[PDB]
Amino acid sequence: YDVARVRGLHPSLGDGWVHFDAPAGMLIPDSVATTVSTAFRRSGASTVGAHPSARRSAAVLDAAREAVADLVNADPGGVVLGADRAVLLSLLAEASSSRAGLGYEVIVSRLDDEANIAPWLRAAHRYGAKVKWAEVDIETGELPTWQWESLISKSTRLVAVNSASGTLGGVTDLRAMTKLVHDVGALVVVDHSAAAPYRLLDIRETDADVVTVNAHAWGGPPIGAMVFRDPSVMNSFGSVSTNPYATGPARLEIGVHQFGLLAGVVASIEYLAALDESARGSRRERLAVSMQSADAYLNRVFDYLMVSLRSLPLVMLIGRPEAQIPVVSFAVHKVPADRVVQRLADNGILAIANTGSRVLDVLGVNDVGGAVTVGLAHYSTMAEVDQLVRALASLG
Amino acid sequence: YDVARVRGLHPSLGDGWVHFDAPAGMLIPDSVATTVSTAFRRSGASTVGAHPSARRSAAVLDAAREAVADLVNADPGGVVLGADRAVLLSLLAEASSSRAGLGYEVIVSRLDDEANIAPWLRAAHRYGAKVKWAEVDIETGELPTWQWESLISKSTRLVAVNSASGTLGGVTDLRAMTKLVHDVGALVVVDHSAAAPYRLLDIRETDADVVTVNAHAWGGPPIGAMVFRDPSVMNSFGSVSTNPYATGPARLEIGVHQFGLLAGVVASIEYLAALDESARGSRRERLAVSMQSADAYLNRVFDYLMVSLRSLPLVMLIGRPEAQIPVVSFAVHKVPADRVVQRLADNGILAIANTGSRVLDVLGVNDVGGAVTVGLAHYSTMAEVDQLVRALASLG
16 A cells, blocks of 8 residues: 555645544545546536437446445445435435334434434434434443344334444444344445445445445545445335436436536545555455555554554543544543644644534533544555644643 | 627537527536536535635535525525425425325426425325315416416415426416415415526515525536525424534535535526626626526527427427417427437437426327427527427428
């Protein structure tokens, strides 16, 4: 893995800011920005018509489904594209109104992003299902595997969970959960958005019924995708398309496709596939090699960060996960998160003052003064971590 | 009005292709494409944080609200932005909850786009309201004003209607009906998306509660807006934001805003305001002048198109409205629409084989063969009309 090369892909780097704000969205690689620029200009209004631009649009749409399918090892026929994972989850929750009806139960996770909590709560409130919560362990921040047996009942119809936390960094163990949920005929919805920049999810191996990703997370355009493991499951969902003759994933797509952005999605996934310049094979094969190489490198950088954070006397790490993406939240003794973030900003360092996380509420963190969240990207270096730690050391 | 100047804003024109496919989306002006290119590259992940890119995203978001507000003479505090009018209308229908419930009536219009029909039907099934239809006059294609008094009852809670048809071109007289709707405490939702490229809707003058538009229609990026006349009505809907600290239109917005496209929206409305390059005053004032001037020109070109089509015995125009935007649908005697559209394409002319129209279905036009839809754009010329007419004359 050659971080110097990857940094070369990012014109927005070296501009006076050190980016530890990855969890809010990584920087846009030049290849993505240039693709969106040309595709927006050259893509037809519609996939229909005799003009070359219409065929370009049709081509972009197909390429985007194929690229997302490669990312999660699915079939393109199961890839639904929309503006954001949050919009797609909202659409799914509405399409699943019967599952959120009187007598049923819907499980959501205290560890999830609001995007994969709010619409399920909203559906339950509107239609009558009981909400059950998967809870975290207070002195680890993880979703313990042993709780799923008591949570899941014959009434369970929908389970919404994340593959990892974009606040605490912990990767969730869903293996037991998935079996139990399937045992009662419930739908398993996995939000892979926080982890997708770092880890490949194999929808065939994990057995999730639906997986969501958000391209914005890895420096792609703001486009989300909702991938069904079994495309047959989509015709169980009522159509929302304004085209009464729609078939396949188009049935779950509302409004004009955003072809310029979709072209950027393809390019952003190609960026992931090319992180290791030596990677050879199909796109899926190259993603595997490149993501592992990047993972190895980020593991080293993150270890240095974590050792450094532990060494800072006033820094209080929130949670401690067994497996991780390179994202960590912490508080500084008698220095509220907003002040930490402002101090960092004064030193040209960008971090996140984590605002509306349920898990942070639960851990009692937003009751002292909040948490600071930092995350690594593929262009992050050891020198940047040293700068962050020295800046944190300067605080009271 | 100077059509030569407007055509200069569209680099592809003059290459042989003749565009009469405006209803599917007009050509994207060069200025709009350039704006999206730069804004996409420069806009930050979110509106929060110390980086200049965050200020940029915040500024474009605010500017998009102001531009849309100018377009319909509203307040930016009532402007909700999203991927498409169809997504926003789906969200609205969902948030209307029991207003679409058993005991009440929802009115939809036979002349409407499926975007402003489907979500209301879906909501009616979920909650139980009786769906009633405003029907067209089978000769003129218009929604007669006299039908409203019997359609609207004390039980009416929601009325979804268009300002004009993007298939038949007829402009809908909503003056009397709006009064009647307000009289029973119902909401009026007006989809202005078909007419927006051509005529201004004044939300203060018309008294519509909610108005939707789609920037793609006039060659802007694929972004929709939903505008509330009264911010108080707006917050009586349930918040769907993943931000619990959302205020104003942000309460009704799901997902990361698409800042690059939002900048394009602003540019596209500036394009509309500058159609008459010599218009003076505020953007709001200039929109009025430029749209009036452009409509005056397009009315003459459309009149020429219409008399020409009426002179071809095989061409059968559908409807005959008192007021019309420059959009028309026609069948060709014993020639299917697909064959008409192909003959046109062979002469480098782009028209639409109309699909999915409830009005064309109800009129019997689609029973065999179907119809062709053509629409003018601000760059359309008399010479292009001649080319269309000659190609149609070659049939039979």
